[PDB]
Design a protein around this ligand. Structure first.
Ligand SMILES: *[C@@H]1O[C@H](CO)[C@@H](O)[C@H](O)[C@H]1NC(C)=O
Ligand SMILES: *[C@@H]1O[C@H](CO)[C@@H](O)[C@H](O)[C@H]1NC(C)=O
Ligand SMILES: *[C@@H]1O[C@H](CO)[C@@H](O)[C@H](O)[C@H]1NC(C)=O
Ligand SMILES: *[C@@H]1O[C@H](CO)[C@@H](O)[C@H](O)[C@H]1NC(C)=O
Lengths: 774, 774
C-alpha cells in the first residue's frame, strides 16, 4: 500500500479516486485499475498545495501545521473501507502511544461516489470522526438521524429538483411529463421533484422508470408512451444520467419525432456534448443545470510547475508520468518497462491541461475543516498561538458543533453556510442547447440559479415571445358563466362546465345557486332580487276597468237625482225607498272594490280590498230577496240579518287570515306583489253568493208574473237571468290565468252594472226618458 | 492488549466481557475495570473447551481444526470497537498475505450488551462478517433490513411480551394495568406488549414511563396513580428491570397497600430474590418469566480441573487467580504485589462454583457456527475431509445463507431453529413467589412456556378456584334484554343498556328494532308478528248484535204472514203493496248487513259488507218519500230512480276503492283485521242518508195530519222523529272508539227495528192483535 504524507500538528486524511475501479476478478486481490487523472492526482496535488497555503497563511491556525495522509480509494467501497481501517488504527495507536511515529487522524475528505461514502459513514459514525464529501449528491445522506457525521460542501439532488420546479414555476407550465433513470440518483431526485411539484399544482403525466441500459425497442416504447401524452405535455424533465438522454435522442432519431419535445434535464448532460454528439438537430432547445465551476489559478500555477525529479512527495506522481505520457523514465524510481519510448527532457506538462470541474469544491471542504479547527482554537484556546490542553486530544463532538456553524468565502467567493441538515445551498448555472448561425449548436449560457435567485434571459431563448406552448391539460375556462370541474385524473384536467341561470360562480369547481326570487349578476358574483309590480300605470288592460268604474260611479249619481230629490213621486213611494237605497249602496261599494283592488298592496289596502268582495253582492242581494219574499215590521230587519250573516262569515275569515302581502312566483325570474288571497278566502264568499243567487232565481221564476211597480218583477227576472250566467262564468276564468286582480275588477263591476242597467235604469226610463211619470 | 488464542484452520473470534466497564475518566485511557467472573473468564474457558470438543468430535468438521482469537470487550462500546478493528485488520492482512502469521477472522460471537452489539453490527455489516450474539434481547435488532448480519440464539423481548400476553389470555383478564421502565429494554417491550394486547382486546389503563432512578415521592405518585385504577385493574405487568420492581415494592411498603396488587413482570426479577429481599410479605403472588438455564456438566468437569500452573493458554487466568482469591502467587508470572497473603497449594477451585446462567447459550452459538460451517463444507466440498477451493477463502454471504437454514439439538437438546428474522424461538420458565409454610417464600416453579405451549399448574397457585378477580372494566351484561354500549374510553368499559320492547338484540353494541306489527322473541333474537282477530266467537259484546239480528229476521217473517197471504184484505189493498214490500226488503238487507259485517274479513266479504250500508237505508227511505210525496204511473219509477242514485254513488265509490283487507294498528303490540273502510266511503253514503232524512222529516211535519190508512202518517212521523235522533247520534259514536263493526251492527239494525216496530207493527196491531181488521 502507498500513502502520500504531509507532517504537521493536526493531520487530516483523504480518500481520492486515484486509480480506476477494480474488476470482478480483483475484488479479493485489490488490483486497482489505471490511474485516473482528473478525479485523482489533481485532487491530491490540490490538497497538498492547499495545506501548504493554509500552513503559510497566518489568518487561520497560526502556529498549527496541518499535515495530511493521502490514501487511495480506487472508486470501490471495499478498498476505501480498508484504507479507513488503516486511518482508524493509526488513530488508535496514536491514542495508545519500526515506525513508532503517531498520527491522530482527525478529519477525512471524500470519496467521490455517494454509494461509497454511504458505506464509509457507517464506519465513521462509530469513531467520532466527522467527514466532509465533495461529490456525493444523494439526498438520503442529509438524514443526520442516521448520518450524523456527514457534511457536504456540495448541494444535494433535492436542490436540483427545486430549481427544476422553479424554472417551470416561472414559465407557468402545469401538465408536464417527466422521466427518470433507475438508481438512487434518478429515483430520489424524481421523488423530490414530484414532491415539490405538488406544492405548485404542476401535474405529471406518468413517470417512466427506465433502466440505464434499456433496449432500443424499450426506448422506442417509452418514446411512444411519451408521445401518447403529447400535445398536452411538451416539456420532458429527465432527472437522469447522460446515457439516458443519449438513448432518448437515439429513440427520437429512430422515431423521427425531433423538433417537438422539450427536454429538461439534470446535470447528466451539463457540459456533456458527447450526449448530443451528432444529434444537434434533435437536441435543440433543451435546458440543463450545472454547478458553478470556476477555474482556480492557484492549482494551475502550483500544478504546471511540477516535475517528477522534484515532486518526490507524491509516491505515484512518477507512475503518472510513466503511464499518462506513455514514456519510460529510466532514471525515475518508478521506471516501468511497459512503455517502449523514453521520456524527453523537453516533454512539457501544459499540453491538454484540463483540470477537474469539481476542483474548487475540494478546496472548499479543506477550508471548511480549516476554519472549523480555527473556530475550535478560538473557542477553547483563547489568545493562544497553538493548542492548549482543551484540544489535547480532539474528538469529533465539539468539532461537529464547530463545523455545523461555520461561514466563510470560498475560492469562488461563495458564502459557504451549512443548514441543519449540513448541506451547502445550491448555486447552479442554467444553459440551453440553442442553435448558432451555422449547423453547430453549443451549451450556451442563459443564466444561473442561487437559492431562489433565478436570473434568466427569456429574450435569449426563442428570440421572441413565441415560445413552446404552455404544457397544460385544461385551458382557463370562460369565468363569466362557465365553471371548472375535476374529471378525476389530475389536478389540472378541469372541464369547462356552464352553470344554471339561477346559479352564480362561487367555487372554482362548484356553482352556488340563488334562492327563489334571486338570480345572479352579470359576473355571476352574488344574487339580485327581481322587482315587484305597483300595478297602477297607463297600462291599457286595467285602464278599461278604471274607466268602467268611473262610468259606474258616474251612473250612480245619474240615478241618484231622480229619487232623492223626487222622494215624493208616487212611482217611487210605492217602491221600496230604503231597500233600493241599500242595494244602490251595495252597488257603490262594488264599484269601490275596483279602486280598492287596483291599488298599492299594503297592510290596510289588501284588507280593504278583501272586505268588499264578500259584502258588496251580499248586501245587494239581501234586500232583493227580502223584497222578493213578500210577493209587517221586519222589512229593515230580515235584510239586516242577511247582511250580518256575511258580516260574521267575513269576520271569521279575517280572524283566521291576517292581512298579509305575499309575492307570487310564476317563474324563477318573475316576482309579483299580491295580497293574502287564499283559496278558502276565495271560495267561502262565493258559496254564500251561490246560495243567494239560486234562491233569488227560484223566487223570481215563481214571481215573474207580478206587474206591480211598473213591471218591476220582469226587470228583476231579466237581471237575474244575466247574473246567473255572470256569477257562474266567473269561476273558471278566475281559476285559470293570472288575472286575479283584472277579472276581479272586471266581473264584480260588470255584475253591478247589469244590476243597475237592467233594474234601476228601466225603473227610471219611465221617469227621465219619459217625463210623464218622473 | 491481551488475547487468548487457539490455532487452527478456521479461526472464530469472540468478544466477552472479561473486565468490568471503565469509568468516565478511562474512556480515553481504556483502563478497564476488575475481572468479571461469571460473564467473563467462564465464557472464555467454555469456548476454549467447546472448540476443543468440536475439534475432537468427527461428526461435524472432520479434518478442520477450529481455532479462536479471544479478545476482551470490557462491557463498553469503544473497547469492543477497537478489538473489532483488530479483528478486521487481522482479516485484511490475512487477505493480503515479526509476527507474520495470518489469521482470517470468519465469525465472531458476542458481546453481551445489546447497546454494544448494535454498535458492533454497524461495523460488521461493511465487511461480510456474520455475528451471533448470546445476550442481546432488543427487538429492533431483528430488523435485517438494517441489521442483516446479526443472528441470535436467544429470543427477543417481543417473545417475552408474547408470553406475557398469552398468560393473561389464558386467565381471561381484560382491563389490566401495565408499567415499564425507561430505556430500550422497557420501551420496546411495552410497545410489543401493547401491540399484542390489542389482538385480544386486553385493555391497558395507562402506561407509566418511570425512570430507572426515580424518586421515592415519584414512586409513591406512580403507586397512587396505579391505585386510582384499582379495583378495576389488579394485575400490573412490569416489563422492566429489577431495581424498578424493588422501587415499586418500596413504594408498596411506604404506602402500606400490600397484599392487593398483582405484579406481573419480565426477567428483571427472574431469580433476583434481592429485589424481594426483606419484602416477602408484599411480593407474594407475583409471576415472572425466565429463560431455561440448564447446568452443563461439560464445563463443570472442564473448569473444576483447572490450575494456574496448567492453564497457560488463558493470559488472564493467573490474574483471575491473583485477584479473585486475593492471594499473591509469587511463582506465577502475574505475581501482583496488591495481595498481601500468599496462595496455598491446597487452595481449591470448587468453593462457591456458581457458573453463568447463560452458559448454554454460548455453546449453542458456537455449535450454530460449527454446523453452519459443516453445512458449507457439505454443500461446497462434497465428500471431502477438509476444505476444497470453493471454501478458499470464505466470505459471509453464503455463510449467512448456511446459518439462516440450520437446525440441530443444543446442549439442552433444544431444537435450535432460525426464522426469517434470524431469531431463536422462546423457551421460558414460569415461576411464582408463593408463600411456604413458614415466613420464607421463594421463586417456586409453576410451569413453563415454549412457542405457544403454555404448560401451567392452576391448582398450584391460590390452592383453589378462589383466585384474584378478573381484571375487567365491565361485567358481561344481561343478554336477554340489556345490551352493551361503548362509553368512549376503552374497548372494555361497556355500559349495560336495555333496549326497547320492539327492539331485539342484533349487535354487541346496538339493538335492531322490529317493524310495525312485529315484536321480538323471548331471547331478543328476531321478530314475531302479532295475530289478528277473527271476530266471531261467543264474545258477549257482538252476541247481542247477533241475537238482535236474529230477532229482526224472525220479526220480518212474523210480519210477512199477514199481508202476503192476506193480499186481498182492504186494509192493505188501499195501502202500498209494492212500496211497503220494497221497504221491507230494505229492512231485510239492513238486517243482513249485521251478518255481512260480523264475519271473516275476505276479498268478497268486505265488499258484501260495504255494499249494503249505503243501500239498505236508501231503498227503505226512497219508497217512503215516494209515498209521502203524493199526499199517475211513475210510482215504481220515482222510487226506482232514487234507489239508482245511491246505486250509482256506491258504484262510483267502489271503482275508486277496490276491496282491500287492512290491519288496524292501535299500538305496537296489537294488529287487528279490518276491511277497506275509508273516511270518504263512510261519509259519502252518510251524506245521502242525511239528504233523505231531512226531506222526509220536512214532508212528515207537513203531512202529519193525514188520517188515511188507519192513521198511517202519525206512525210515519213517530218513526221519523226517532230516526232523526238515531242517524244523528250515529256519527260521534262511530267517530269515537274502535267500535267500527260493533256500532255498525248495532245502529243500522236498531234503525231498521224502529222502522219496523213503529211503522209496520202498529200497522198490523189492528190486524193480528185486533182480528176485526185483519
Ligand atoms: C406565465 O408564463 C408565461 C411564460 O411565457 C408568461 O408569458 C406569462 O406572462 C406568465 N403569466 C403571468 C400572469 O405573468
Ligand atoms: C455567516 O453568516 C452569519 C449569518 O448569516 C453571519 O452572522 C456571519 O457574519 C457570516 N460570516 C461572515 C464571516 O461574515
Ligand atoms: C376462560 O374462558 C373460557 C371460555 O369459556 C373458559 O372455558 C375458561 O374456563 C376460562 N378460564 C378461566 C380461568 O376463567
Ligand atoms: C430442522 O427442522 C426442519 C424443518 O422443521 C427439518 O426438516 C429438519 O429435519 C430439522 N433438523 C434435524 C436435524 O432434524
Amino acid at each position: 500500500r502507498v500513502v502520500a504524507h504531509m507532517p504537521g500538528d493536526i493531520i487530516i486524511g483523504a480518500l481520492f479516486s486515484v486509480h480506476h475501479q477494480p474488476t470482478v476478478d480483483k475484488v479479493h486481490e485489490r488490483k486497482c485499475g489505471a490511474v485516473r487523472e482528473q478525479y485523482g492526482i489533481q485532487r491530491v496535488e490540490a490538497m497538498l498545495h492547499t495545506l501548504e497555503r493554509i500552513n503559510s497563511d497566518p489568518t487561520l491556525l497560526p502556529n498549527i501545521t496541518l499535515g495530511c495522509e493521502i490514501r487511495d480509494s480506487c472508486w470501490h467501497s471495499a478498498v476505501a473501507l480498508e484504507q479507513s481501517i488503516e486511518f482508524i488504527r493509526d488513530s488508535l495507536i496514536s491514542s495508545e502511544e519500526s515506525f513508532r511515529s503517531k498520527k491522530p487522524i482527525v478529519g477525512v475528505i471524500g470519496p467521490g461516489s455517494s454509494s461509497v461514502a454511504i458505506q464509509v459513514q457507517n464506519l465513521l459514525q462509530l469513531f467520532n470522526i466527522p467527514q466532509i464529501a465533495y461529490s456525493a449528491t444523494s439526498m438520503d445522506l442529509s438524514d443526520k438521524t442516521l448520518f450524523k457525521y456527514f457534511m457536504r460542501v456540495v448541494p444535494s439532488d433535492a436542490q436540483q429538483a427545486r430549481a427544476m420546479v422553479d424554472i417551470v414555476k416561472r414559465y407557468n407550465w402545469t401538465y408536464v411529463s417527466a422521466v427518470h433513470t433507475e438508481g438512487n440518483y434518478g429515483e430520489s431526485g424524481m421523488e423530490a421533484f414530484k414532491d415539490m411539484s405538488a406544492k405548485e399544482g404542476i401535474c405529471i403525466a406518468h413517470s417512466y422508470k427506465i433502466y440505464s441500459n434499456a433496449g432500443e425497442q424499450s426506448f422506442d416504447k417509452l418514446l411512444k408512451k411519451l408521445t401518447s401524452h403529447l400535445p398536452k405535455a411538451r416539456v420532458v424533465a429527465c432527472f437522469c444520467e447522460g446515457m439516458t438522454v443519449r438513448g432518448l435522442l437515439m429513440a427520437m432519431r429512430r422515431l423521427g419525432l425531433a423538433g417537438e419535445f422539450l427536454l429538461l434535464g439534470s446535470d447528466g448532460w451539463a457540459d456533456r456534448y458527447d450526449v448530443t454528439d451528432g444529434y444537434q438537430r434533435e437536441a435543440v432547445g433543451g435546458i440543463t443545470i450545472k454547478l458553478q465551476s470556476p477555474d482556480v489559478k492557484w492549482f494551475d500555477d502550483y500544478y504546471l510547475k511540477l516535475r517528477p525529479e522534484t515532486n518526490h512527495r507524491n509516491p505515484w506522481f512518477q507512475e503518472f508520468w510513466q503511464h499518462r505520457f506513455q514514456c519510460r523514465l529510466e532514471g525515475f524510481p518508478q521506471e516501468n518497462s511497459k512503455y517502449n519510448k523514453t521520456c524527453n527532457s523537453s516533454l512539457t506538462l501544459k499540453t491538454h491541461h484540463v483540470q477537474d470541474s469539481k476542483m474548487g469544491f475540494v478546496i472548499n471542504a479543506i477550508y471548511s475543516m480549516a476554519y472549523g479547527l480555527h473556530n475550535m482554537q478560538m473557542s477553547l484556546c483563547p489568545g493562544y498561538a497553538g493548542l492548549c490542553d482543551a484540544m489535547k486530544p480532539i474528538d469529533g463532538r465539539k468539532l461537529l458543533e464547530s463545523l455545523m456553524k461555520t461561514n466563510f468565502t470560498g475560492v469562488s467567493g461563495d458564502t459557504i453556510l451549512f443548514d441543519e441538515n449540513g448541506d451547502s445551498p445550491g448555486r447552479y448555472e442554467i444553459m440551453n442547447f440553442k442553435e448558432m448561425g451555422k449547423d453547430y449548436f453549443d451549451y450556451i449560457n442563459v443564466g444561473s440559479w442561487d437559492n431562489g435567485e433565478l436570473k434568466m434571459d427569456d429574450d435569449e431563448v426563442w428570440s421572441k415571445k413565441s415560445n413552446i406552448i404552455r404544457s397544460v391539460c385544461s385551458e382557463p375556462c370562460e369565468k363569466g358563466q362557465i365553471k371548472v370541474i375535476r374529471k378525476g385524473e389530475v389536478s389540472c384536467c378541469w372541464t369547462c362546465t356552464p352553470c344554471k341561470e339561477n346559479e352564480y360562480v362561487f367555487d372554482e369547481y362548484t356553482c352556488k345557486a340563488c334562492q327563489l326570487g334571486s338570480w345572479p349578476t352579470d359576473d355571476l358574483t352574488g344574487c339580485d332580487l327581481i322587482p315587484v309590480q305597483y300595478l297602477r300605470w297607463g297600462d291599457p288592460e286595467p285602464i278599461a276597468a278604471v274607466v268602467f268604474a268611473c262610468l259606474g260611479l258616474l251612473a250612480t249619481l245619474f240615478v241618484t237625482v231622480v229619487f232623492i230629490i223626487y222622494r215624493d213621486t208616487p212611482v217611487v213611494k210605492s217602491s221600496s225607498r230604503e231597500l233600493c237605497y241599500i242595494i244602490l249602496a251595495g252597488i257603490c261599494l262594488g264599484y269601490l272594490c275596483t279602486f280598492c283592488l287596483i291599488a298599492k298592496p299594503k297592510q290596510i289596502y289588501c284588507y280593504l280590498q278583501r272586505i268588499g268582495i264578500g259584502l258588496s253582492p251580499a248586501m245587494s242581494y239581501s234586500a232583493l230577496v227580502t223584497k222578493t219574499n213578500r210577493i209587517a215590521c221586519a222589512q229593515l230587519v230580515i235584510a239586516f240579518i242577511l247582511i250580518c250573516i256575511q258580516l260574521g262569515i267575513i269576520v271569521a275569515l279575517f280572524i283566521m287570515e291576517p292581512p298579509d302581502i305575499m309575492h307570487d312566483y310564476p317563474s324563477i325570474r318573475e316576482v309579483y306583489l299580491i295580497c293574502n288571497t287564499t283559496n278558502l278566502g276565495v271560495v267561502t264568499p262565493l258559496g254564500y253568493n251561490g246560495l243567494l243567487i239560486l234562491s233569488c232565481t227560484f223566487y223570481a221564476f215563481k214571481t215573474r208574473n207580478v206587474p206591480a211597480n211598473f213591471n218591476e218583477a220582469k226587470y228583476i227576472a231579466f237581471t237575474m237571468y244575466t247574473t246567473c250566467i255572470i256569477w257562474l262564468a266567473f269561476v273558471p276564468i278566475y281559476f285559470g290565468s293570472n288575472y286575479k286582480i283584472i277579472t276581479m275588477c272586471f266581473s264584480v263591476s260588470l255584475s253591478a252594472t247589469v244590476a243597475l242597467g237592467c233594474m234601476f235604469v228601466p225603473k227610471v226610463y219611465i221617469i227621465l226618458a219619459k217625463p210623464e211619470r218622473n
